[PDB]
């Protein structure tokens, strides 16, 4: 189990090679924040594979110089490169060479003979090398090694310092010059240390903090201050000073983050009537099919869930859950009755009687063909139902053929009477109330639409969330967006009036499209953040002041000025000291 502990101030390192002097110099650079937890390890009875994250701190407490190795990378599959580092008999030995790794890669110790630990040639860290893109060669003590990869550069820093503490990272400040830069170009998501096996060490993780360094005359960083650590240190980053003297400094701002979002669209969003297509009492027959315009409305497929439904459902263009997710343009649901097998014959590229003659659909048609038995209804003896048994071409896209004209087989003109091979091309289906599955009529419907590209007539039902109050939320109403605190407001909006507004021309009230009511809006919070402090010469204790909020969204004293955190109201009244606002003067003493 990882035993954490308190980083204190370690992990500062010369962010560049520049020299400076006596100059507090802000810098925004991946560091190890102060007082963070470090994931602390041992060597006893301990070198797991860890995430590399963005970078890594590291240390060890070496009286024994045992922790000699590092293996970095992502896969560690020997296929990519991996760094390797070995510090042995004062000769540093370094490689990016590629090789494949042990269950427990390490170095050996054969305890106590002429060669102490022996087992230099232990060297079971790995299978064997493969490809090499680089080479270089060269509790009292502590070795702090920062590692980070940026722009082909892995990078190292170091310090070797004497200490005496057995337990933990000594509390004191010193910072880490670079040793190296390696222009390797690996990607590294993980790494593992390596050891000489027969001793503590640590890990941090670097974060994009911004610190205030302080160089000294010789140019050595003698101190640092984390900006984000805590108010007193949000100040010192403002002034560029370690000394922060009395009075109220304004560091930063605070904007209450929104809860989630609110999407709201006018109830019912009207409707698209596929019923009077599908449930129309007298269908036009297949041979003359309805073409029926449907518009300004919302994909209505929620009526089509409850019914005996439809002997088939085929709608060509796009996914049937894009019925209700995708709006269409020219929407014609084609109301007609066909004989049973004729659902095949209604489809693009169909050779067939329906297709080639009475009801013909395009190869480019995007939409439906849907069957159901009307033998349960349309059957009688009904010979009014009819079809084009023969015609001299295919119908043009969505075209109909109405012809009662004589079908003329021979060059002998029939002239409106019957004769030898004189035909009336249209013919009827006798419906026999004993009709079976092959003989049953199928009422069949076809939705004309472009897919996209023209206005939404049949639309998709658009998801309107629920409504929350008194709580900062993002929102959209009816395409009006913004972010606010939606409350209940007596603002009597006009019947046709949508928004409200305000002298500054800033959206204010709205009316809930579904249920009609006057919601205010209200900005989120803002406020500055002022940091009251008695001069750092006196204390380190600061009392933040959140200007101009009510104390929630944050020993708290709500003021006329704002939400004051960290000071103790006092009935007594003394002369002013660090004037805050509205007559409230903080001061340090008991």
């Amino acid at each position, epitope marked *: 189990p990882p035993a954490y502990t308190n980083s204190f101030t370690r992990g500062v390192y010369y962010p560049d090679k520049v020299f400076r002097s006596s100059v507090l110099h802000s810098t925004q650079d991946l560091f190890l924040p102060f007082f963070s937890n470090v994931t602390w390890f041992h060597a006893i009875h301990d070198n797991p594979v860890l995430p590399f994250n963005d970078g890594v701190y590291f240390a060890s407490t070496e009286k024994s110089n045992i922790i000699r190795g590092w293996i970095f990378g992502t896969t560690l599959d020997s296929k990519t490169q991996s760094l390797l580092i070995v510090n042995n008999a004062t000769n540093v030995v370094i490689k990016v060479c590629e090789f494949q790794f042990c269950n427990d890669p390490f170095l050996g110790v054969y305890y106590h003979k002429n060669n102490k630990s022996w087992m230099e040639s232990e060297f079971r860290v790995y299978s064997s090398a493969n490809n090499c893109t680089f080479e270089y060669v060269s509790f009292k003590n502590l070795r702090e090694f920062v590692f980070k990869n940026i722009d082909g550069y892995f990078k190292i820093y170091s310090k070797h310092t004497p200490i005496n503490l057995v337990r933990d990272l000594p509390q004191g400040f010193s910072a880490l010059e670079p040793l190296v830069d390696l222009p390797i170009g690996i990607n590294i998501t993980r790494f593992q240390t390596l050891l000489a096996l027969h001793a503590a060490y640590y890990v941090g993780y670097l974060q994009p903090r911004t610190f205030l360094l302080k160089y000294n005359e010789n140019g050595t960083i003698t101190d640092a201050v984390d900006c984000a650590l805590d108010p007193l240190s949000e100040t010192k980053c403002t002034l560029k000073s370690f000394t922060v003297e009395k009075g109220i400094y304004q560091t930063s701002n605070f904007r209450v983050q929104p809860t989630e979002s609110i999407v709201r669209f006018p109830n019912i969003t009207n409707l698209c009537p596929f019923g009077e297509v599908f449930n129309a009492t007298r269908f036009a027959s297949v041979y003359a099919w309805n073409r029926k315009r449907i518009s300004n409305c919302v994909a209505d497929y929620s009526v089509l869930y409850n019914s*005996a439904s439809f002997s088939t459902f085929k709608c060509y263009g796009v996914s049937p859950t894009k019925l209700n997710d995708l709006c269409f343009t020219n929407v014609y649901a084609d109301s007609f009755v066909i004989r049973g097998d004729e659902v095949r014959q209604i489809a693009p590229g169909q050779t067939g009687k329906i297709a080639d003659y009475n009801y013909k659909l395009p190869d480019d048609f995007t939409g439906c063909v849907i069957a159901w038995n009307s033998n349960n209804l349309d059957s009688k003896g009904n010979y009014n139902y009819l079809y084009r048994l023969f015609r001299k071409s295919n119908l043009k896209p969505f075209e109909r053929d109405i012809s009662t004209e004589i079908y003329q087989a021979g060059s002998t003109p029939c002239n409106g009477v019957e004769g030898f091979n004189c035909y009336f091309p249209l013919q009827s289906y006798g419906f026999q109330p004993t009709n079976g599955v092959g003989y049953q009529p199928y009422r069949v419907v076809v939705l004309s639409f472009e897919l996209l590209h023209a206005p939404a007539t049949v639309c998709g039902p658009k998801k309107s969330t629920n409504l929350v109050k008194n709580k900062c939320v993002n929102f959209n109403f009816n395409g009006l967006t913004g972010t606010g605190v939606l409350t209940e407001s007596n603002k009597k909006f006009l019947p046709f009036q949508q928004f409200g507004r305000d002298i500054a021309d800033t959206t204010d009230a709205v009316r809930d499209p579904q249920t009609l009511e006057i919601l205010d809006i209200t900005p989120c919070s803002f406020g500055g953040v002022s940091v009251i402090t008695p001069g750092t010469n006196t204390s380190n204790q600061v009392a933040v002041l959140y200007q101009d909020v009510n104390c929630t969204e944050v020993n708290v004293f709500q003021t006329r000025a704002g939400c004051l955190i960290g000071a103790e109201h006092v009935n007594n009244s003394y002369e002013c000291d660090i004037p805050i606002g509205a007559g409230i003067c903080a001061s340090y003493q008991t």
Partner: antibody
Amino acid sequence: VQLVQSGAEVKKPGATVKISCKVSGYSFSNYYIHWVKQAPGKSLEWIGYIDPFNGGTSDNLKFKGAATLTADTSTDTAYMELSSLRSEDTAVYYCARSEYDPYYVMDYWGQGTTVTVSS
Amino acid sequence: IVLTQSPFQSVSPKEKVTITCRASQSISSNLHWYQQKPDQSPKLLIKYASQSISGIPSRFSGSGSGTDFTLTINSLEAEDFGIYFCQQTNFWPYIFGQGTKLEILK
């Protein structure tokens, strides 16, 4: 006569599985393909029919995977892409040879494709 | 437009069993019976509810009356029994029987 499916697909929930139904032994263009789901120890469940010549996807919605049935006419292989995977979609996905016209019969099928949808 | 089966039927060899497919409201005179062996693709026994695909035992028959469609087996063999399905026809997607595991005693 022959319908061969892509092997078992193990995904995390919310991911996508697409499954190949490879036709052989008959004419692909003359037969729709039914796509049949059997949840383990549960009943037969039909996700949709496809057309060889066209976009003939119908979708039983019920369980919604944003599914679309694509048929590859060169290789006679209908795909079922099942997205938005859920641990209940875990099942053996059969593809079933369908008639190209109204008489819906599935005489011959794939071998079934187990999909284990889990974290 | 959903159909109902009996979850289980236990019979003895040579005895006649009938497994029902009961569809809600309207029914379609076509139906399709399936014998699913354990861990194996169901196989269509009965087509249009009146017909066997070729090679299927003559003891495998089907029918329907009212809203019910029967899977009727005469003179069972202990090799025969298996999980049985009926498939709705038309009315949008074919709603397959919940399944019936047939047991044969003796």
